[PDB]
Design a protein around this ligand. Structure first.
Ligand SMILES: NC(=O)c1ccc[n+]([C@@H]2O[C@H](COP(=O)([O-])OP(=O)(O)OC[C@H]3O[C@@H](n4cnc5c(N)ncnc54)[C@H](OP(=O)(O)O)[C@@H]3O)[C@@H](O)[C@H]2O)c1
Lengths: 247, 245, 242, 255
């Protein structure tokens, strides 16, 4: 039997709200593999739930960070530096678009909403990669989360599709720029885990004839960060039961 | 002979600042085909440059609009409506990133530089598309410009590559949303208009401005009435190559 | 008014068996632009059909050649050389897969059926390109037809999808090899030509034969002189849909 | 600590001729994970080479089959059925194009060379997939090997690129057809690695290019391909099918 041993590795998972978050799933697997994981929550409303997740992970370090606030991000990676010394893995599981933009048509998207959506969902990767760069060790890695709508039109995904398009292009450039220093950057294109019409259609259309699970996304995230994927960087890997290959 | 007759057609061309731009080349070809063109220019300090461009096209309407200002875009489309009644073609050749963002690494892009680059280079297509929608007639079309760096890493392209990726995805969604009313949306992926391209490209040369112009013309013309949501490459085949030669 | 003047240009159109085909549409447009066209036909039992097509084009040269027979392909290109002196355009509209391969699952395709489908549908492009190369003049071009099943799974397309994937990769490599001599190679990815496609596509309709014709004409014309190694979609936007 | 326990799992590995192949690397990793492997070999003249491979894997079943011969593939899968009862994994590492096709230009490929390259390199996947289907258990998988030349022009790769393009499309369609029975199909797009690579005259200019151009500034190793093969076949990748995954040190993302 092969073992994935991440003892002594340090992990920061940003973007956690519930136990059903894809970010948590990756964290669960990372802790299971022996890593020290820290979580970061958006605002004070979610601290209680964040503490419950830390408990489920058998204990975890917590930070509050809003990705729109450069000051808060500065504080986060200062707290990480003090608490971990270095960093191995960074999970980027953050996305947002104003509700007003996620309804109706993409063409009707309002200026301030469009930018907010691109700021949180795409720029935040650049923001956190810059701050993690001097902390990241050899074999280190950043992984983000995206969706098929970046390449093909999925109605009602609107500006988020565009954000993901910007996210994935970011992944490639960051992979190119952090590669020399032994850091890998990849994206997980998850299937669904406005929504239910997409969820019940993947099940029917996808080759596996079902939806993917939260654990299946976790497993991919674990692998990509693990030394088992040491030759893999700049990739967008799909865990979607084969949906995206269907015409 | 087959003829492309675009007389009676009305076109709005945005983002053209010089005659050696790809946006100008498209405008030129539309004018050659018989269409009436209106140029937009960013600010009144650029009016003399805009007037030279109008003259070089053999006559063109001018309108002032900064694409980060919604009010001015409303004004421009009101002026286009009054002057033309409707619209057939919109050429989006606006591309900008702050100088600091383009110098150094992508990972070092500052927050507001990054947002501005995306605002001017990607969101502007959405902003003009929404305002053009009520003016656009059946068989009408929107065309924009993009580059290969959206899909593959081209160093020193930084945030523009990201903006272009956002732009191409915008083209797809706009093609879906504007399609039912007979409006097509497409992107032209132009090669550079440099030393390594000519050596690597299948054609063993760089493309010309006129070659981009011809594709722009084609895509907007009724000859391309089945084509929408596409990114079409005019790069002498360069992007199909897996190696530098 | 911009004009596309293709007078004095010589074209070879292969794979056309009926007037409602996409290959015919391109030929019609080439003829309309002023070019001389030569049609190929598979066997002598099909000459009556081939003559009808020539007449529909308002006159065209005919040559017999089966694309699985190298000897006949040599003869056809010798005939084309004799009759035209050189060649400007080659339209590859050949597509075939045995009926047994297209019925049932792709995984059940028989060896000889699978090979035959790829021979007629993909290798034929290589075979006719090699023979056209010495005839092709500067600014000359080759264009072929493909479908979106090459990239995405369209059930019941089976081995044709694979053939098209093989075809499109061939297009890229041929573009690279024939490029230095001023020859461009491109593919047209057509949507179907008439019900559900009409419901999903951005334009809310299917494409027409003429729309494929127009793209074919454009790609071969000097207006597309900077475009090579491409797969261009005429599908009313359909393939962009998730 | 997360463990990948593949004991009790049965694997068929096809197209392995040397220990320095990518197919061998996958087989080794499957063996390390606890699976039992059966190696196929083309002809009986190659039995000594096959035995050395079996020993290097720490023991493996051997079966003779030429993938262009439908009768022999029937025989091999009958033999695998008798010896294993069922199957979990199939590794497709078969790749061949005649020497004349790989020398010169793609446009000069002869008819029968072209067809043979496609027969051995692409159709063989369909052939073995059909026969593996009734043997394959839930959670089972097929993995094959491909490369970047399928999507972009890599000179001197010729018909192999076309075959790889035909192979990847096959992977998609096979993933759709074998999916309902819980079988996944995927392809590994490996960067250049220094035996089967020797039959490709455009490999080395690319090998030197990758180390300078790739984001990681090095070539990948055989073990890195092995690890991905193991991952894709393991239950850890149970949501992944119809995919082409790149292990190329990031090379193919570069413009
Ligand atoms: N779930 C799916 O069906 C699916 C499918 C494909 C891809 N994905 C991607 O997977 C990633 C994880 O999302 P999820 O679906 O698992 O849901 P999720 O974790 O509950 O939501 C994403 C996280 O981002 C956080 N966030 C939003 N704005 C933020 C800000 N300004 N500053 C800091 N954090 C912020 C959210 O906090 P708040 O809840 O407080 O806003 C939330 O914890 C997302 O990028 C998503 O696009 C999800």
């Amino acid at each position: 039997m092969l073992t994935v041993d991440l003892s002594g590795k340090k992990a920061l998972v940003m973007g956690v709200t519930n136990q059903r978050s894809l970010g948590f799933a990756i964290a669960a697997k990372l802790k299971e593999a022996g890593a020290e994981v820290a979580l970061s929550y958006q605002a004070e409303r979610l601290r209680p739930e964040a503490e419950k997740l830390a408990e489920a992970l058998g204990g975890a370090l917590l930070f509050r960070a809003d990705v729109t606030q450069d000051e808060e991000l500065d504080a986060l990676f200062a707290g990480v530096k003090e608490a971990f010394g270095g960093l191995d893995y960074l999970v980027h599981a953050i996305a947002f678009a104003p509700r007003e933009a996620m309804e109706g048509r993409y063409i009707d998207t309002r200026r301030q909403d469009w930018l907010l959506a691109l700021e949180v969902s795409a720029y935040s990767l650049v923001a956190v990669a810059r701050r993690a760069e001097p902390l990241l060790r050899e074999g280190g890695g950043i992984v983000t989360l995206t969706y098929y709508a970046s390449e093909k039109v999925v109605p009602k995904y609107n500006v988020m599709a565009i954000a993901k398009a910007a996210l994935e292009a970011s992944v490639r450039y960051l992979a190119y720029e952090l590669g020399p220093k032994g850091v890998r950057v990849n994206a997980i294109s998850a299937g669904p885990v406005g929504f239910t019409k997409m969820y019940d259609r993947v099940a029917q259309t996808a080759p596996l004839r079902r939806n993917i699970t939260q654990e299946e996304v976790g497993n991919l995230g674990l692998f990509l960060l693990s030394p088992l994927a040491s030759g893999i960087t700049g990739e967008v890997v799909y865990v979607d039961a084969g949906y995206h290959i269907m015409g």
